[PDB]
């Protein structure tokens, strides 16, 4: 029979080049011991310049004696970006492509009397393999399962593009009936003739046997026999949807015709459904209107990168499934078998694509390698009924149009780009006639003007109005313009989203403060547009997770923080705005404050400090309590309500209540509240650490110190705050702090900062980062109540640009105010943070 | 006058030795930019062999023109383990000790016409500097503040063992009156004499002037001058406790005698309190009985090491204070000024000690460096009224008794130890006659036999009965035997605790399973003993935090996990047990399930699955609800109550309430629950991932995958479980897994593992790790051989994780895995089953 098991254990690993690494007699005792899956690019979660090059893997294979007469097939589900395989020093074969599987019949290279050496040379530097550009990390290593499969000399073909070698499709599907087509190849690796029996057994969703198909086949020595068997038409087929994922098991068995001995067996699911995309009326599933409620999912997890175990892929899926999504855009690369299994079985429509992104280079072999990767993806995943569309390109004009601004520079690149698109479109439709082709665009009409949008069956727009410029309403405007000018191109919003940082909150959220609240304002705008516009087939949110992009700075360097869930897969609050809107079958009532559990605020006297607490829910009406006090009931709109909550106590308990389908629904949590006095005196200074996010309207809570830094405020008589200057903001990474966001904002041209406070000894901490690398170069003095504390401070000369300075001073105040004045010398005065404590 | 500011910023740094690193014109462009505080030992949070050696720090000094005629004093509050200071290439000084400060008048080497180069060479390799052994990482680098203080040529001495040069004490303190003594040194670095007015201003707690001393003094060029000025006795003085931290500010000022212009100035707090330790009745503060409710606290935080900013120090102090502690054992080394500031001002009694641990080696120069470190600690922190006791040794016999067995071998080592001990003891009492001396013992009467327990004023026992062997009840038995045999040695339990791991839970918690629940068990037993035994002066819990100890393996390698709060300072549920028992001023009601938010259990049919939910509270009666259904009222004992809670829904809401001094009190949280079926069939297998922590009574929940692995259960008809074997357990780290504990337990001599299950195709994952440092065995499934001869230790080695997956076709009504040993034993560390087709 067939024995399939992993060989993920007991590997030795070496980063870099190594002469002789494939020899069986090599001494790899000093190499690193590892267990697949594996990447050598954990460094990308800190370092922007992560290592791209060569890495070697070694494993001993001591084969079972019971396998002496079988064919041994080696399968690498993934190696990024390329792999060359060695058995006992001999080059067995290679593979180009970091997200498709490859497979090899290694039987002629193996020995059953002595042990064998399997060595793999992996490379993530090759410029002739996609992607060569794109907003994610190109991790190197063997980060998916590796298998050995042992079969008898007659077995299904396992070396057709690293696939299962079988291909099952439904040529016709209606409510009344459907046809079923069962195809594949049998391979005869014996030196003589073989007379076999092929059997297809087809089961209903409930497990009962529907039909058995039997053919005799004769194979000459060494022959590959293609079979194509049609089943009896299936009457009143049970139709598949993400809500009702009815599967029909197809068991395909190979038997010795004489002896009836079982040789090989391969199992697959098929399912019966049909779909359609309409430019006016959107998407239809089994003849009914169906809004695609989608998410995109990258495949890494900080800090192990793409080296996920399969229960991790399943965990990601359950989260997406429990949120209400019925559609996943698997991007920008094809992903784990374990993922697609859940899409079929638990129910989720799928788009899947290869990563041809940003720009079509002029690299020999690139086109050819793209073609092979498209075939490998379609053939490896042909049997997943959840998949309805293949794609091969994403924003293929984005870098082209940035780099080249002349007609002469552009013409060749566009020509090369349209030729490869048309090339791949032909390959797609010849690989698979049962599915729709798609392509994803960045937000520009150049895709219509260049002809790129005239190629695939449907089109996707990556739209970010209200995040990367423009206003939120430019999103529906853009879609309306496209539908007017190209009404026959059915439309998916293949990317939309906005960045967010658990550390940052704002009562006045604005784009690129990275506050939790701004991403919610953005998503709260976009989802109803997606739900209620008929010519929008659906959208796929970007992205389900905060994911690795080594090249990103912004509020969380190395991470693209547009997730609905943090990197470690804890959900953000806004996850439950999706759930509330997309799950009708359960009550959803979520106090939107897990993202904001450490609050602080400026208190007048002993009066409460008010701060919004938002709720996400599908209940019509909710009541909010704090420490047992009701704040009233509110009517929900767009799945949300916001209460102005009076905080006083240090550890308040928040509690929410409503009715859903005649039952009581409840939620609650404790958070922390810290009051900071607006007017300082001897009493209220004891224990006070007054910290201010100068130049920002965001509260910043360090996930390292747990200290919250308050939004800046202007100086007022009896209080404290700034004097002069204007807000400034950088996105560049800030050296030498864990609290980047605090230093990315400053008050530029500041004139002073003042606290009215009693007489005593105070510790003053100032925070500096020069964000104007443009610079002349800022240098300035600083005094406090007229006592110079810096004669000529220049952060960029002493430390450089975009680097933290935190300087503490002890000062004796003999006034009733602490007046910090800035005194220009060159460039501008600025201040990114201030923090005050009373010492004596 | 005096300006103090930091130079923590704008450093370059290079790991290792370097030719010509102190040269003013050395090229450090390609060095790593860093900002103090800093450590080069972040590696210690993953690598056991952390880098111990040399590191180089360079920063430019551009002196303000206003300092031209001032004295510049450099201060390094801490550098581990030793540091040497260059200014413009010239050796200025060096210091030995990684937890005390050092200072140098650097004026002679500085220019004011050109930038100055500051270079510091640091070394955490040196074996002649305490500690040379002990249960924590010897972090290297400059991990506390660095200061420049500029003063006039007539200034208080700032180069007396890196202290402030002033020393304030109260010779007599009673309810009616107290005496106050103010001492210090004035130095005169001018090239000729000078005439000064020295003034002490003393302020009440409410900020009012109580008294002004003034004394005239003259100093010849380059002379230092010692003063000691008694003060008018203070009448009906405001006493200080953790609860009432009444402090008197003392301002000391230096004015030129003719021009009366102010020169230098230094502020310090004093306070009025007395105390004593009674071998029979415990501890007394201001004449009243007082239970010492202490915790110990290491100073690092994963993964930044001890490179903490001062708000992190203050954050730590607040959690300890909000938990209700009144005592803190600052160990095993003196800690940050920022922390001590809070013990004075917000109120916590303090024990502070230097890290002389495990064994007094024969290492040239070790003794001398120890004595200097003791002098330093005491001089540097002399003015902190929170401190009532100094110490210098912890468990100084522990490694000595492992390494040397015979009387002949022990002789010299014991001689060195008693000598070093008595020597430091006498240095302590020279340095400070106002505080109590202490030492900390491990749990052996040999500290008595060898005479070590006669030396200090009080003794500390680090006791671990119920964790490192023995029984929970051995704790009180050990202490009652000491009291019987040494009634005049007043006792503090200076350490006690149990490891815990958020990933691990058990309905039957046992020591060294590292379950949340066992730590709670251990502590719930110890704390009443501490509270209710009067000859126990108090205790200090070990430890307040999970902290770095690179040499440790066990469930969380590199980490000692006996904290009350995780390394990131999130509290464990048990933290609120202490808070229930030590805070009577407020209501405490805490559902003890923040450590257990991801639950799973074997479900019979569709009946609910019972799992305990514990509650910590100072109320006498609590009610627990799940998803709105009440589970009754329960009377609390020992600040806690447990409910058998019926789980069913996937995302249940837990809710508790009761009454405290009139008011209604509430708490709630959501958690996640995943039922696993006891009897598998075609329906319940859809989406099922049956994962079993084979060999263990703990649920293990990966913090990497979030999957929960169930307690092993024996096979029963109609269900699933193991067949044969016994539990086996290792504490050695496991390579190549983030889920160590999963692999550190196993079923040894296992015969089979069986699932009753429908026909179909199944994915079976087997987890192996050989912990027995050669086992070899075949594995069959339903009569088909799936491994002819598997030997984990030959394929992978010992203590290395093996995860193997197989696709299996079951044409029977069960899945029968069998183990056939041909050598060594058969073992299996975990299994996980999915149905595929
Ligand atoms: O900027 C972003 O968030 C993303 O936006 C896009 O349009 C890209 O297709 C995607 O790869 C980037 O990650
Ligand atoms: O092993 C432990 O947990 C502790 O035991 C002790 O008694 C040691 O003094 C301490 O440094 C250790 O950390
Ligand atoms: Ca996989
Ligand atoms: Ca400090
Ligand atoms: Na700021
Ligand atoms: Na186990």
UniProtKB/TrEMBL annotation, chain B:
Residues 690-826 form the Malectin domain. GO terms for molecular function: hydrolase activity, hydrolyzing O-glycosyl compounds; metal ion binding. Keywords: Calcium, Glycosidase, Hydrolase, Metal-binding, Signal. Ca(2+) binds at residues 145, 310, 336. Residues 280-582 form the Glycoside hydrolase family 2 catalytic domain. GO terms for biological process: carbohydrate metabolic process. Gene3D superfamilies: Galactose-binding domain-like (2.60.120.260), Galactose-binding lectin (2.60.120.430), Glycosidases (3.20.20.80), Immunoglobulins (2.60.40.10). InterPro entries: Beta-gal/glucu_dom_sf, DUF4982, Galactose-bd-like_sf, GH, GH2_Domain-Containing, Glyco_hydro_2, Glyco_hydro_2_cat, Glyco_hydro_2_N. Residues 611-648 form the DUF4982 domain. The keyword Transmembrane helix does not apply. Residues 170-273 form the Glycoside hydrolase family 2 immunoglobulin-like beta-sandwich domain. Residues 6-152 form the Glycosyl hydrolases family 2 sugar binding domain. Belongs to the glycosyl hydrolase 2 family. This is Glycosyl hydrolases family 2, sugar binding domain protein. It comes from Bacteroides uniformis str. 3978 T3 ii.
């Amino acid at each position: 029979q067939r024995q399939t098991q992993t060989i993920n254990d007991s590997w030795k690993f070496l980063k870099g080049e190594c002469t002789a690494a494939a020899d069986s007699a090599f001494d790899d005792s000093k190499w690193t011991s590892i267990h697949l899956p594996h990447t050598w690019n954990t460094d990308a979660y800190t370092e922007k310049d992560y290592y791209r090059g060569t890495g070697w893997y070694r494993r001993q294979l001591t084969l079972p004696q019971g396998w002496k007469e079988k064919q041994i097939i080696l399968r690498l589900d993934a190696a990024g970006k390329s792999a060359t395989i060695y058995i006992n020093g001999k080059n067995v074969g290679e593979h180009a492509g970091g997200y498709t599987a490859c497979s090899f019949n290694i039987t002629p290279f193996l020995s059953f009397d002595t042990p064998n050496t399997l060595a793999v040379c992996v490379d993530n530097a090759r410029q002739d393999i996609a992607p060569i550009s794109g907003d994610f990390t190109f991790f190197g290593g063997i980060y998916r399962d590796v298998w050995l499969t042992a079969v008898p000399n007659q077995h299904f073909n396992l070396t057709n593009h690293g696939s299962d070698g079988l291909f099952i499709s439904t040529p016709q599907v209606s409510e009344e009936q459907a046809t079923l087509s069962i195809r594949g190849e049998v391979k005869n690796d014996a030196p003589e003739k073989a007379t076999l029996e092929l059997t297809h057994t087809i089961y209903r969703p409930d497990g009962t046997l529907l039909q058995t198909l039997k053919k005799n086949i004769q194979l000459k020595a060494g022959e590959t026999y293609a079979f194509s068997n049609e089943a009896t038409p299936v009457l009143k087929p049970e139709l598949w949807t993400p809500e009702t994922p009815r599967l029909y098991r197809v068991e395909t068995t190979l038997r010795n015709r004489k002896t009836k001995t079982l040789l090989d067996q391969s199992n697959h699911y098929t399912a019966f459904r049909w779909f359609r995309f309409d430019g006016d009326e959107g998407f239809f599933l089994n003849g009914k209107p169906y809004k695609l409620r989608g998410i995109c999912r990258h495949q890494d997890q900080k800090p192990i990168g793409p080296a996920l175990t399969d229960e991790m892929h399943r965990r990601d899926f359950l989260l997406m499934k429990e949120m209400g999504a019925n559609f996943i855009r698997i991007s920008h690369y094809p992903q784990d078998d374990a993922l697609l299994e859940m899409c079929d079985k638990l129910g989720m429509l799928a788009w899947e694509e290869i990563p041809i992104i940003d720009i079509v280079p002029n690299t020999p072999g690139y086109g050819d390698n793209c073609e092979r990767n498209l075939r490998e993806m379609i053939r490896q995943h042909y049997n997943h009924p959840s998949i309805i569309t293949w794609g091969y390109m994403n924003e293929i004009l984005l870098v082209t149009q940035r780099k080249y601004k002349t007609e002469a520079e552009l013409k060749p690149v566009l020509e090369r780009t349209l030729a490869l698109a048309n090339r791949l479109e032909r390959v797609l439709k010849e690989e698979d006639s049962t599915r729709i082709s798609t392509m994803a665009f960045h937000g520009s009409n150049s895709y219509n003007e260049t002809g790129l949008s005239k190629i695939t069956d449907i089109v996707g727009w990556n739209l970010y109005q209200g995040w990367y410029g423009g206003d939120l309403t430019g999103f529906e405007k853009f879609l309306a313009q496209q539908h007017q000018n190209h009404p026959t191109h059915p439309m998916i919003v293949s990317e939309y989203g906005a960045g967010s940082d658990k550390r940052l909150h704002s009562l006045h959220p604005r784009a690129f403060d990275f506050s939790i609240e701004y991403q919610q304002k953005y998503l709260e705008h976009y989802l109803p547009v997606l739900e209620d516009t008929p010519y929008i087939c659906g959208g796929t949110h970007w992205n389900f997770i905060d994911f690795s992009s080594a090249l990103r700075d912004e509020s969380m360097p190395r991470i693209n923080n547009k997730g609905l869930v943090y990197a470690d897969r804890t959900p953000k609050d806004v996850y439950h705005y999706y759930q509330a809107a997309w799950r009708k079958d359960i009550p959803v009532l979520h106090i939107a404050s897990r993202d904001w559990t450490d609050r602080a605020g400026v208190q007048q006297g002993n009066a409460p400090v008010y701060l919004p607490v938002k709720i996400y829910t599908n209940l019509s009406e909710v009541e909010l309590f704090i420490d047992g006090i009701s704040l009233g009931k509110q009517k929900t709109e767009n799945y949300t309500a916001t209460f102005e909550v009076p905080f006083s106590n240090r550890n308040p308990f928040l509690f929410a209540q409503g009715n859903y389908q005649g039952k009581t629904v409840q939620d609650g949590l404790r958070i922390n509240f810290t009051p900071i006095p607006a007017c300082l005196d001897a009493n209220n200074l004891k224990g006070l650490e007054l910290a201010v996010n100068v130049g920002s309207q965001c509260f910043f809570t360090s996930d390292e110190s747990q200290l919250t830094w308050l939004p800046d405020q202007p100086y007022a008589a009896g209080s404290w705050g700034y004097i002069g200057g204007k807000e400034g903001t950088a996105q560049t990474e800030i050296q030498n702090t864990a609290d980047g966001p605090l230093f990315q904002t400053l008050r530029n041209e500041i004139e002073g900062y003042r606290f009215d406070a009693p007489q005593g000894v105070y510790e003053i901490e100032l925070l500096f980062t020069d964000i104007f690398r443009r610079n002349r170069e800022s240098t300035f003095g600083i005094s406090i109540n007229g006592e110079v504390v810096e004669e000529s401070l220049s952060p960029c000369k002493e430390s450089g640009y975009f680097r933290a300075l935190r300087k503490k001073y002890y000062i004796t105040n003999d006034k009733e105010y602490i007046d910090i004045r800035f005194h220009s010398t060159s460039g501008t005065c600025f201040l990114n943070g201030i923090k005050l404590r009373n010492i004596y």
